[PDB]
């Protein structure tokens, strides 16, 4: 229905985003310039204050001090407080009105998972930009992998939850810097593995998790559960 118009939209968004980067780069230059000015100011004040303090009333010094405290520090304060981001933030705010939202992001994640399921694609192939045509181009981060795994999880696809969580963990092992909570990754991964019936592996992953978070309530309970049954 509105399908073909939506293609038109994504193309427009790609060009909009390029304009946002231009704006962002302008903001950066403005902040760099402001910071260079403050650094030179701080350097001057550093020299003045250091000299004045390592000294264990003269009207020249008194005038210079009164004026610096009363006047010069207020001008410095005004510069520190000066916002350089208005232009960038104004444009971003206007442009966001046309951005995809959380539902769109989830929709796209599901469409990727659907493609994977249809062509039986392996995760590393998807993640490392090894799908045909677009060769070695778009890469998924460890966090992207975790997110896809969690979408699979909400749909009760524990098989793909397992594959995506393991990909996230492999990328970390390979040295990817990331902010994902590896405990949480293991939390979902151990449950997905448990659901498919591999108790041995679920037990293993539970022990891995407890190394990282000894107080993890759910994992501690899972270990007692496994130790009860498996033993």
């Amino acid at each position: 229905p509105g399908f073909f118009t939506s293609i038109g939209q994504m193309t427009d968004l790609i060009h909009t985003e390029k304009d946002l980067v231009t704006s962002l780069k302008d903001y950066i230059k403005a902040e760099e310039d402001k910071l260079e000015q403050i650094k030179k100011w701080a350097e001057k004040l550093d020299r003045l204050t250091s000299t004045a303090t390592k000294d264990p009333g003269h009207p020249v010094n008194a005038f210079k001090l009164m004026k610096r405290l009363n006047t010069e520090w207020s001008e410095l304060e005004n510069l520190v407080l000066k916002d350089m981001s208005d232009g960038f933030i104004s444009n971003l705010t206007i442009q966001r009105q046309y951005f995809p939202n959380d539902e769109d992001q989830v929709g796209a994640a599901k469409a990727l998972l659907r493609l994977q399921d249809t062509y039986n694609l392996d995760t590393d192939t998807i993640s490392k930009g090894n799908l045909p045509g677009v060769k070695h181009k778009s890469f998924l981060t460890a966090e992207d992998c975790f997110e896809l795994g969690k979408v699979a999880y909400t749909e009760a696809d524990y098989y793909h939850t397992e594959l995506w969580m393991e990909q996230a963990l492999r990328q970390l092992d390979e040295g990817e810097i990331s902010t994902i909570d590896k405990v949480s990754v293991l939390d979902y991964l151990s449950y997905a593995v448990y659901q498919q019936g591999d108790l041995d592996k679920a037990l293993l992953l539970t022990k891995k998790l407890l190394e990282l978070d000894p107080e993890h309530q759910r994992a501690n309970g899972n270990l007692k559960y496994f130790e009860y049954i498996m033993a």
Binding site: A202, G221, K224
Partner: peptide
Amino acid sequence: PPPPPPPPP
């Protein structure tokens, strides 16, 4: 008895 089985996170 043991704890309840692993719950979904």
